[PDB]
Amino acid sequence: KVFGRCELAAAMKRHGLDNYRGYSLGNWVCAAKFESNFNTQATNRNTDGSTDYGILQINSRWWCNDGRTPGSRNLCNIPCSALLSSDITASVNCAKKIVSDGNGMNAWVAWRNRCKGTDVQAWIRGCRL
Ligand SMILES: [Cl-]
Ligand SMILES: [Cl-]
Ligand SMILES: [Cl-]
């Protein structure tokens, strides 16, 4: 599924991501924009052989099982394919664990490089939330 901007913001809010770990909704929408362009089916192979999955590009090196990332963990206790669903529940639940791991949203390098410190409120501008 390719979400609209406000559609995703609403879905994130419905799943308790709004201000989770002190990160406003715009931060989450911005991260999704630059990780996946709001496409739940996005997958990208990393140079090390792990893969990033879904709307928030969650990495099989630590968070989900894809069966082909030797030496990796599955800390969200989920198949990586579950992170590609139209319903964002699994990606949100797993993102909550990631953002709680110590470094906040810096875990998402695209958030750090493209969202951190910017006017992230713009991402929810106009949205009926
Ligand atoms: Cl957009
Ligand atoms: Cl915001
Ligand atoms: Cl594996």
CATH architecture tag: Orthogonal Bundle
Number of helices: 4
Bound molecules: chloride ion
Instruction: Evaluate the radius of gyration.
Output: 14 Å
Class per helix and strand makeup: mainly alpha
- Tell me the number of strands: 3
Largest sheet: 3 strands, antiparallel
Helix content: 25-40%
Strand order within the widest beta sheet? 1-2-3
How far apart are the termini? 20 Å
Proportion of residues in extended strands = 5-15%
CATH topology group: Lysozyme
Supply the CATH class.
Answer: Mainly Alpha
State the domain count. 1
Shape: globular
What is the H/E order? HHEEEHH
Oligomerization category of the chains in this entry: monomer
How would you describe this structure to a colleague?
With 129 residues, this protein is mainly α. It has a single domain, classed as Lysozyme, CATH 1.10.530.10. It has helices at 5-14, 25-36, 89-99, 109-114; strands spanning 43-45, 51-53, 58-59. A 3-stranded antiparallel sheet has the order 1-2-3. α1 crosses α2 (25-36). The radius of gyration is 14 Å and the shape is globular. Bound molecules: chloride ion (CL) (3 copies). It catalyses: Hydrolysis of (1->4)-beta-linkages between N-acetylmuramic acid and N-acetyl-D-glucosamine residues in a peptidoglycan and between N-acetyl-D-glucosamine residues in chitodextrins. Substrate binds at residue 101. InterPro entries: Glyco_hydro_22, Glyco_hydro_22_CS, Glyco_hydro_22_lys, Lysozyme-like_dom_sf.
